[PDB]
Amino acid sequence: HYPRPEGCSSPPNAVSVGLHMDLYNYPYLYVKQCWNPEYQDPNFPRYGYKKYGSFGSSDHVNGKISWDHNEFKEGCKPIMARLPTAYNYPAKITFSNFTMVLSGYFKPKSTGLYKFEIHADDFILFNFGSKNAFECCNREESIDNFGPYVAYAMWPNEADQELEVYLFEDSYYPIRLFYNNRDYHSKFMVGFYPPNTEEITYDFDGYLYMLDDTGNEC
Ligand SMILES: CC(=O)N[C@@H]1[C@@H](O[C@@H]2O[C@H](CO)[C@H](O)[C@H](O)[C@H]2O)[C@H](O)[C@@H](CO)O[C@H]1O
Ligand SMILES: [Ca+2]
Numbered sequence: 001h002y003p004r005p006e007g008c009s010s011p012p013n014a015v016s017v018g019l020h021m022d023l024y025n026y027p028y029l030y031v032k033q034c035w036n037p038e039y040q041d042p043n044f045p046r047y048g049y050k051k052y053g054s055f056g057s058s059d060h061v062n063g064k065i066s067w068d069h070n071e072f073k074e075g076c077k078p079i080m081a082r083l084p085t086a087y088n089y090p091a092k093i094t095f096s097n098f099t100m101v102l103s104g105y106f107k108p109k110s111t112g113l114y115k116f117e118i119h120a121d122d123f124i125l126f127n128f129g130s131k132n133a134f135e136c137c138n139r140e141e142s143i144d145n146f147g148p149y150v151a152y153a154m155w156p157n158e159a160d161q162e163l164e165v166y167l168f169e170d171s172y173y174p175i176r177l178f179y180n181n182r183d184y185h186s187k188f189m190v191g192f193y194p195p196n197t198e199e200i201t202y203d204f205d206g207y208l209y210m211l212d213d214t215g216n217e218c
């Protein structure tokens with residue numbers, strides 16, 4: 001059968017809307033290969049990604065969280081631009097070169113099979129489930145204790161991926177999205193097909209949530 005990941009329960013008053021975001025610096029080797037190949041090291045997603053420090057965070061990240069910026073005209077240099085309004089983050093970022101971690105919970109609107117689809121420039125990792133993304137109600141502490149990727153998308157050669165999970169309406173599923181841009185254009189597209197649906201959506205409104213971190217499977 002299809003994969004059936006593990007989820008979490010919580011009283012509605014311990015639940016709030018949307019994901020948490022952390023933004024981390026990702027420098028060029030030099031500013032006018034110019035780009036840093038570090039993002040390719042296997043230890044980068046687990047510990048290396050924090051080594052240039054962070055620069056911002058947000059909460060309640062909900063709705064239309066994908067983007068495709070291919071309008072930039074210059075490579076090998078930092079370009080300032082804004083995230084979608086879904087991110088509740090007002091400052092411009094070095095959209096040319098940065099790392100982001102989005103985490104929290106995905107709650108399906110009905111029981112059944114969900115297909116996710118990702119498209120990356122440069123790099124997207126997808127962890128999903130309480131035995132794959134992070135522990136129920138213990139997100140801060142366990143965020144980098146993720147398991148083998150549910151999907152691994154990397155530009156140019158493996159930039160498109162998909163994956164299928166059978167989900168239950170009553171459950172909040174730990175979800176962890178890792179994104180990196182090494183240089184220039186940036187694509188973070190994460191979409192899904194709910195059950196019996198042939199048309200993809202990139203709008204997560206009503207699917208994304210955060211449970212309080214009380215260490216006890218809630
Ligand atoms: C080093 C550099 O800037 N090379 C250029 C290409 O840059 C890459 O662009 C792809 C998208 O096509 C990715 O975003 C990748 O992360 C970038 O390093 C770029 O496509 C072309 C367009 O002029 O110029 C190359 O020199
Ligand atoms: Ca944070």
Ligand SMILES: [Ca+2]
Pocket residue numbers: 121122181182183184185186
């Ligand atoms: Ca890029």
Ligand SMILES: [Cl-]
Pocket residue numbers: 004005006007128129130131132
């Ligand atoms: Cl799981």
